[PDB]
Structure 1
Amino acid sequence: AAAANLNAVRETMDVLLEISRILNTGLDMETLSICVRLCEQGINPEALSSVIKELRKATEALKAAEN
């Protein structure tokens, strides 16, 4: 049963990876589950998306400043 859960999680992760690669989102595998599952606790999808966008902008700024 738990092996079934693991297999289903892997399958969902692969489906999500394909969806992300098709969307060309640029989101990393680190947001494999942590990104989606944390919002799965009932986070405001608009607020979470805005927070992700702010994190992306800050990360881009940090990369540019490091460069």
Structure 2
Amino acid sequence: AAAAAANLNAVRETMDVLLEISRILNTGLDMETLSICVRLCEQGINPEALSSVIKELRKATEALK
């Protein structure tokens, strides 16, 4: 339909405003990682818990780099 494309357009605009907010803080995350982190919080998840794995894994991709 048209409303089946209008929603997929309507989330792309928000995802790019979020991407601008992501790059002005200049966190080391990119769009592909961001696509997981958005999907996880729609089902509900504790942000203090996801920050724990990401703050572990970014210092674990240098001990195993």
TM-score normalised by the shorter chain: which range applies? 0.7 to 0.9
Q: Report deviation, 1:54.
A: 1.1
Provide the C-alpha distance between the structure 2 equivalents of 1:15 and 1:37, rounded to a whole number of angstroms: 16
Provide the C-alpha distance between the structure 2 equivalents of 1:60 and 1:12, rounded to a whole number of angstroms: 32
The two structures, once aligned, show a CA RMSD in angstroms of 1.3
Q: Report deviation, 1:7.
A: 0.6
Q: Report deviation, 1:40.
A: 2.3
The higher-RCO structure (CA 8 Å, 6+ apart) is: 1
Q: Report deviation, 1:39.
A: 2.6
TM-score of the aligned structures, taking structure 1 as reference length? 0.79
Q: Report deviation, 1:20.
A: 0.9
Of residues 33-42 and 12-21 in structure 1, the stretch that sits farther from structure 2 once superposed is 33-42
More helix by share: 1
**Structure 1: runs of 5+ lacking an equivalent:** none
**Identity, % of aligned pairs?**
100
1:13 is aligned to 15
TM-score of the aligned structures, taking structure 2 as reference length? 0.81
Alpha-carbon displacement from aligned partner over 1:6-63 (angstroms, at most 9, x marks no partner): 1111101111110111001011121232112113211111011111111211123222
**Which runs of 4 or more aligned residues in structure 1 lie more than 6 Å from their structure 2 counterparts after TM superposition?**
none
1:39 is aligned to 41
